[PDB]
């Protein structure tokens, strides 16, 4: 499925992920795309802070959703 991530500069990157991907997996993909170290990445979705060991489905993140780096 496709989701979008907004960086701290407002840039929007697209990611191909699976419903079961963990936040840790997503952070690794962001690192490959932008070079931002995982440990300095904090992701938010609908006002919810996302934990590394949980999956996208755990947060009801569906196709075309947008996450924010803060
Ligand atoms: Zn938004």
From Swiss-Prot:
There is a cross-link at residues 6, 11, 27, 29, 33, 48, 63 (Glycyl lysine isopeptide (Lys-Gly) (interchain with G-Cter in ubiquitin)). The modification (Microbial infection) ADP-ribosylthreonine is found at residue 66. The gene is UBA52. The record marks 54 as: Interacts with activating enzyme. Residues 1-70 form the Ubiquitin-like domain. The modification Phosphoserine is found at residue 65. It is found in: Cytoplasm; Nucleus. Phosphorylated at Ser-65 by PINK1 during mitophagy. Phosphorylated ubiquitin specifically binds and activates parkin (PRKN), triggering mitophagy. Phosphorylation does not affect E1-mediated E2 charging of ubiquitin but affects discharging of E2 enzymes to form polyubiquitin chains. It also affects deubiquitination by deubiquitinase enzymes such as USP30. Mono-ADP-ribosylated at the C-terminus by PARP9, a component of the PPAR9-DTX3L complex. ADP-ribosylation requires processing by E1 and E2 enzymes and prevents ubiquitin conjugation to substrates such as histones. Changing residue 63 to R: Abolishes HLTF-mediated polyubiquitination of PCNA. Exists either covalently attached to another protein, or free (unanchored). When covalently bound, it is conjugated to target proteins via an isopeptide bond either as a monomer (monoubiquitin), a polymer linked via different Lys residues of the ubiquitin (polyubiquitin chains) or a linear polymer linked via the initiator Met of the ubiquitin (linear polyubiquitin chains). This is Ubiquitin. Changing residue 65 to A: Prevents phosphorylation in case of mitophagy. Impaired translocation of PRKN to mitochondria. Changing residue 48 to R: No effect on HLTF-mediated polyubiquitination of PCNA. The record marks 68 as: Essential for function.
């Amino acid at each position: 499925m496709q989701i979008f991530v907004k960086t701290l500069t407002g840039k929007t990157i697209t990611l191909e992920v699976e419903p079961s991907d963990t936040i840790e997996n997503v952070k690794a993909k962001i690192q490959d795309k932008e070079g931002i170290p995982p440990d300095q990445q904090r992701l938010i979705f609908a006002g919810k802070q996302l934990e590394d060991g949980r999956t996208l489905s755990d947060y009801n993140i569906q196709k075309e959703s947008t996450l924010h780096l803060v």
